[PDB]
Nucleic acid binder design. Structure first.
Ligand SMILES: [Mg+2]
Ligand SMILES: [Mg+2]
Ligand SMILES: [Mg+2]
Ligand SMILES: [Mg+2]
Ligand SMILES: [Mg+2]
Ligand SMILES: [Mg+2]
Ligand SMILES: [Mg+2]
Ligand SMILES: [Mg+2]
Ligand SMILES: [Mg+2]
Ligand SMILES: [Mg+2]
Ligand SMILES: [Mg+2]
Ligand SMILES: [Mg+2]
Ligand SMILES: [Mg+2]
Ligand SMILES: [Mg+2]
Ligand SMILES: [Mg+2]
Ligand SMILES: [Mg+2]
Ligand SMILES: [Mg+2]
Ligand SMILES: [Mg+2]
Ligand SMILES: [Mg+2]
Ligand SMILES: [Mg+2]
Ligand SMILES: [Mg+2]
Ligand SMILES: [Mg+2]
Ligand SMILES: [Mg+2]
Ligand SMILES: [Mg+2]
Ligand SMILES: [Mg+2]
Ligand SMILES: [Mg+2]
Ligand SMILES: [Mg+2]
Ligand SMILES: [Mg+2]
Ligand SMILES: [Mg+2]
Ligand SMILES: [Mg+2]
Ligand SMILES: [Mg+2]
Ligand SMILES: [Mg+2]
Ligand SMILES: [Mg+2]
Ligand SMILES: [Mg+2]
Ligand SMILES: [Mg+2]
Ligand SMILES: [Mg+2]
Ligand SMILES: [Zn+2]
Lengths: 127, 98, 155, 80, 60, 118, 24
RNA sequence: CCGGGCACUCUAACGGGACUGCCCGCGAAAGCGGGAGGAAGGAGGGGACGACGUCUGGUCAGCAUGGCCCUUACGGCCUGGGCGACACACGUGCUACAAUGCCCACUACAAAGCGAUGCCACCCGGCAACGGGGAGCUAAUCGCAAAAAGGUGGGCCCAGUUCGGAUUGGGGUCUGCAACCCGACCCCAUGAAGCCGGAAUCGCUAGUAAUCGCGGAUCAGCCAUGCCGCGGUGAAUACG
């Protein structure tokens, strides 16, 4: 009836509710392409479905909040891959070589005193 | 409507103060809402490490105020019975609104 | 890299062509971390190359990149006082970065007003054996085979 | 670009001093340490010694200079 | 600093704008945090000592 | 097309072309194009003379302009120069006026560098 | 750029408001 | 938004989780190479943490302090001025020289903090800074608030310009006893240099550099482009 996964990337979450249907995707009460589409990378979020040829099987209702839109796209990608395995756990063996079910642990590195932005060192003269 | 606002710099003091309050109100009142945790207000102070510069050596400290909510629903007496003065914790601080 | 071999970064396959060389070329177009703008340049430049020419932009992009790959180049090496320009082969990895960097640099030296126009026109001229990038390549292979007298300092 | 917006500020030190000098006719030089104050029409024709921080400098006050402050005419720095 | 310069405490300042912070412990003039009423140097000495409740070492 | 005292912008958008007048910036041209009811986007060459005369009418005597302005400004200097004003002193020696620092970076007001020995 | 105060971006760079950058 | 619920996001307290534990190969061992499983692997990423000592390093001007000097004065009060001087020189930065750009309208996605006479929704006046009125909030409930780059639409068409925002004239707002020296802010007009910088030299190895905004400490105000934090987008390259 319905399948779900959380998905997270770089201070951003996107609840993915997968439901069998025509193949139309809703995000925050808007079309998938009324939220994105001006952003080239947008189609990456749906790469889990293309790997298993699940395009036309499911609809998707998504709630994304937090971060910026590009991390929102990666967070969708994970939530879509997570729900996709809860549907069929045999989809792990196919989804895993691509790494769609891997969380991306890279987050903004904290600024450090004595530098300018956490690595960039103030420039000096010596003379 | 009985709001109980717990605040303190030590998170162990609040939980030691909140859990004691539910154990008194659960013997009398309805199913209490529970020790719901509110977000922390974190004041930071960055300070240059020595006197008389070495500007680029600062160490900073933080002081955190943790918050909790209680919300006993329909308490009448045997709730307020154990609730007059029985609490141990010192650094805790409690407010009540109706 | 003093300790290790400094493994190569593996880039994401392209969203459109599924090719990693595209993304790598897109990244050289990017400035100040605006990858969305840099992609729209390249892809709108693929419309230009595919309309003004009845060919497939993917194959022209590769055929252009190939003609800018240098087979040799010169480096310096300190020997007995002042150093020397020493000719030696180019790693297949370095032929990647040099050809790509040159194409982007050449195209922005171009007269054309808009960016995607310059990319497409450069790629076309480069794939035909002319244009600014192939000059930097034919001029480098001229350094070698000129300093060919120092082919014994190979290192 | 200069702004006091209303109640154009003048110190009470010389204000009561200058308006009383008018009832008795124009007086001679005047001691002033308050350059905070502006200039008002009823000063024109007098002379006022403003302070530099070091010295008292006589300032003939004229029609054209009503809008300004004392000390605009008593400069502080000494260069060349 | 100077004892006579701790006239801030007695302010009656004759103008509100002449009130300044004046770290209480060491009599510091310059850098006085307003929440502890202490200077940055006194603040650091009292923090390490443990006489400021709830003030830990910041780390993240 | 002559709008102010002799002033001929041409071939560009009218609003941007009025900027070529002395006492007119973007703010005043956008205002004249408004109160005279003229499309700002039209090329100067395409301007109706009936609109051109309406523009001249407004602009010429609404604000003081090219010749008078320069004179008024210049007379507004002499005035605070002929009085002993401090502001007028800084105008005499050719130094910044708004209370900037001169120990460095006076270059725009100070006639770029003239170096000495050390 | 960010230096022109009577441009919008030069207003947000100074954190101010006015004719060239209203509030609402 | 109400009814209602805690599943989810989240908030903030306790735990689980990774150990070269498992497979192959090498090895005497410690370990190294590779593979599966796993959110994560060989120190997963970032902090706090800096040994015996060195430089007679820095600070008696934060504080403490030995000794030496001053005591109608080196002390004390005040008003005013100075710490802002300018023929020059260096350091550190900001804003730029533009079309991968600028401007205008419309529209979308953050994290971290601050606020009781303070943050100030909202309404009226004002082109505006701001003023009047006034709601809410002892604040996951109200407010600062708008994130900006971004996206869609339009304008500019390679020009000292619709680039650039110095300088200067003029009008005004606010703080403050008081803006002359010497404040920030708004509006009009002015619209300089600068068309990617000689010798030389600086930073960074991955959410890094680059770029984009946001907040805070001190503070009535502010010369903060500084400092300390926050998140958005997000590279190149390392043979050796
Ligand atoms: Mg950043
Ligand atoms: Mg962090
Ligand atoms: Mg520094
Ligand atoms: Mg410092
Ligand atoms: Mg250190
Ligand atoms: Mg030598
Ligand atoms: Mg040599
Ligand atoms: Mg040489
Ligand atoms: Mg040589
Ligand atoms: Mg002392
Ligand atoms: Mg003060
Ligand atoms: Mg004391
Ligand atoms: Mg501009
Ligand atoms: Mg680690
Ligand atoms: Mg560690
Ligand atoms: Mg660790
Ligand atoms: Mg010494
Ligand atoms: Mg020492
Ligand atoms: Mg002490
Ligand atoms: Mg100084
Ligand atoms: Mg001199
Ligand atoms: Mg001299
Ligand atoms: Mg609002
Ligand atoms: Mg209005
Ligand atoms: Mg709440
Ligand atoms: Mg709420
Ligand atoms: Mg609450
Ligand atoms: Mg556009
Ligand atoms: Mg020039
Ligand atoms: Mg211009
Ligand atoms: Mg140009
Ligand atoms: Mg390193
Ligand atoms: Mg402030
Ligand atoms: Mg200044
Ligand atoms: Mg600031
Ligand atoms: Mg700021
Ligand atoms: Zn102190």
């Amino acid at each position: 009836e319905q399948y779900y996964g959380t998905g997270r990337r770089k201070e951003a979450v996107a609840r993915v509710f997968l439901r069998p249907g025509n193949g139309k995707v809703t995000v925050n009460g808007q079309d998938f392409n009324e939220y994105f589409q001006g952003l080239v990378r947008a189609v990456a979020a749906l790469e889990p479905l293309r790997a298993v040829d699940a395009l036309g099987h499911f609809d998707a209702y998504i709630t994304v909040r937090g971060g910026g839109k590009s991390g929102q796209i990666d967070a969708i990608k994970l939530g879509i891959a997570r729900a996709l395995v809860q549907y069929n756990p045999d989809y792990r063996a196919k989804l895993k070589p691509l790494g769609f079910l891997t969380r991306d642990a890279r987050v903004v590195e904290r600024k450090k005193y004595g530098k300018h932005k956490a690595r960039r060192a103030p420039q000096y003269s010596k003379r | 409507k009985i709001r109980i606002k717990l605040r303190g710099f030590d998170h162990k003091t609040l939980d030691a103060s909140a859990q004691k309050i539910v154990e008194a109100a659960r013997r009398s009142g309805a199913q209490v809402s529970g020790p719901i945790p509110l977000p922390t207000r974190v004041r930071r102070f960055t300070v240059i490490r020595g006197p008389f510069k070495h500007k680029d050596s600062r160490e900073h400290f933080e002081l955190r105020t943790h918050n909790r909510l209680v919300d006993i629903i329909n308490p009448n007496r045997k709730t307020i019975e154990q609730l007059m003065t029985l609490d141990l914790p010192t650094g805790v601080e409690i407010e009540i609104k109706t | 890299a003093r300790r290790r071999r400094a493994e190569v970064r593996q880039l994401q396959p392209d969203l459109v062509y599924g090719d990693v060389l595209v993304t790598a070329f897109i990244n050289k177009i990017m400035r100040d971390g605006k990858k969305n703008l840099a992609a729209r340049i390249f892809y709108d430049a693929c419309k230009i190359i595919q309309e003004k020419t009845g060919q497939e932009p993917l194959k022209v992009f590769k055929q252009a990149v190939e003609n800018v790959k240098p087979r040799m180049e010169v480096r310096s090496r300190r020997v007995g006082g002042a150093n020397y320009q020493v000719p030696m082969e180019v790693s297949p990895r370095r032929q990647q970065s040099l050809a790509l960097r040159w194409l982007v640099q050449a195209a922005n030296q171009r007269p054309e007003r808009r960016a995607a126009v310059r990319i497409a026109h450069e790629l076309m001229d480069a794939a035909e054996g002319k244009g600014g990038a192939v000059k930097k390549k034919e001029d480098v292979e001229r350094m070698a085979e000129a300093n060919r007298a120092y082919a014994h300092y190979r290192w | 670009p200069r702004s006091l917006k209303k109640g154009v500020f003048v110190d009470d030190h010389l204000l009561e001093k200058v308006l009383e000098l008018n009832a008795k006719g124009e007086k001679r030089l005047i001691k002033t340490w308050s350059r905070r104050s502006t200039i008002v029409p009823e000063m024109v024709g007098h002379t006022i010694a403003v302070y530099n921080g070091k010295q008292h400098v006589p300032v003939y006050i004229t029609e054209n200079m009503v809008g300004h402050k004392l000390g605009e005419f008593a400069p502080t720095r000494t260069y060349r | 600093a100077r004892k006579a310069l701790i006239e801030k405490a007695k302010r009656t300042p004759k103008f509100k704008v002449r009130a300044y912070t004046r770290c209480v412990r060491c009599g510091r003039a310059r850098s006085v945090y307003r929440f502890f009423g202490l200077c940055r140097i006194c603040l650091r000495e009292l923090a390490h000592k443990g006489q400021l409740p709830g003030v830990r070492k910041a780390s993240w | 097309a002559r709008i102010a005292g002799v002033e001929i912008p041409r071939n560009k958008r009218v609003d941007v072309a009025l900027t070529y007048i002395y006492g007119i910036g973007k703010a005043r041209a956008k205002e004249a194009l408004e109160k005279t009811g003229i499309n700002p986007a039209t090329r100067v060459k395409d301007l109706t003379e009936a609109e051109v005369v309406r523009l001249r009418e407004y602009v010429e005597n609404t604000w003081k302009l090219e010749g008078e302005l320069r004179a008024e400004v210049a007379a507004n200097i002499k005035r605070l120069m002929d009085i002993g004003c401090y502001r007028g002193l800084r105008h005499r020696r050719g130094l910044p006026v708004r209370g900037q620092r001169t120990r460095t970076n006076a270059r725009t007001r100070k006639g770029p560098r003239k170096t000495v020995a050390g | 750029g960010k230096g022109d105060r009577r441009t919008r971006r030069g207003k947000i760079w100074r954190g101010t408001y006015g004719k060239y950058r209203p509030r609402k």
